[PDB]
């Protein structure tokens, strides 16, 4: 039960990756993939708590 | 994994699987290694799946 909205790149090496990524540091956000041509187990559901 | 860092930045560190940053205490049972030299136009074509 906490919120986190961060666009800063999370480093995964030794050099400080404040704004440079591509060699050894990864972006912490990735996109979803929802195609109708996918399987039944790869379909998006609109879930509410 | 100290040999991974002091051998210059790598062009293509992109990979699918467990991140190497959390392999400090994750002891395994069996592991093998092998190397080869291939054209860089298909270095992105070496990936699982």
């Amino acid at each position: 039960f906490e919120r986190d909205i961060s666009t800063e790149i999370y480093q995964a090496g030794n050099k400080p990756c404040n704004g440079v990524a591509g060699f050894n540091c990864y972006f912490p956000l990735r996109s979803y993939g929802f195609r109708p041509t996918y399987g039944v187990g790869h379909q998006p559901y609109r879930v509410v708590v | 994994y100290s040999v991974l860092y002091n051998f210059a930045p790598f062009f293509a560190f992109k990979c699918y699987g467990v991140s190497p940053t959390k392999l400090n205490d994750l002891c395994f049972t069996n592991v093998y290694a092998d190397s080869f030299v291939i054209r860089g136009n298909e270095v992105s074509q070496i990936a699982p799946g």
Epitope: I9, V20, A21 | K14, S44
Partner: antibody, heavy 126, light 109 residues
Amino acid sequence: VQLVQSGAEVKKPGASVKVSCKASGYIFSDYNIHWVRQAPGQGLEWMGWISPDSDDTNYAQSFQGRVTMTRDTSITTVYMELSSLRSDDTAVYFCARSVGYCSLNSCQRWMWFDTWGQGALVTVSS
Amino acid sequence: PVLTQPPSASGPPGQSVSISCSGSRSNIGTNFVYWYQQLPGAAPKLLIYKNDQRPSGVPERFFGSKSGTSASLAISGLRSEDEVDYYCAAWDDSLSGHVFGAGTKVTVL
């Protein structure tokens, strides 16, 4: 696919252009359309993107009051309205089909333009 | 701001010519760069996306690369179609809009 649009002739400054990029070869509910201009010599300039299903238009930080958007569904076109033009950006306008649907500004990370509309020579002169 | 590009990195045909696309800290280095192919006096089109894969119909001879803050595209040999301009572009969080290149022209010798 086809991204055909009409060609507006020379118009005096202080009016609004009228060009419609007709959508064909796909469904008009999932593909974001983008509008750019290309002055000779220099590169390209980005204006904005239009949601095909709803009126959710986000504009750039270059032009805000000059450019105003509206959309339609039954005709399956797009309306251009550039009020108070100035004779300093005589450029050809292109409509570029981009794969993927997104509504927020953070979506522009895995976005590219696959096909672009053909040339429509549009300028302003007296 | 705008991406800095060389004016004309031309090269003779028969050997590879390297082109560079240097940006800023926020313009590139956190997002993915794209390279756009345009015929002279015609509409542009995309050449490569996400520095890893190419669209269908795009020849394998082409290749794209990045250096953390500068993007590089590799072409080996020039032909009757390789006398065209190369554009480099990406997206940035500083301006919350598209950032496009300046312009580069390559010609045979």
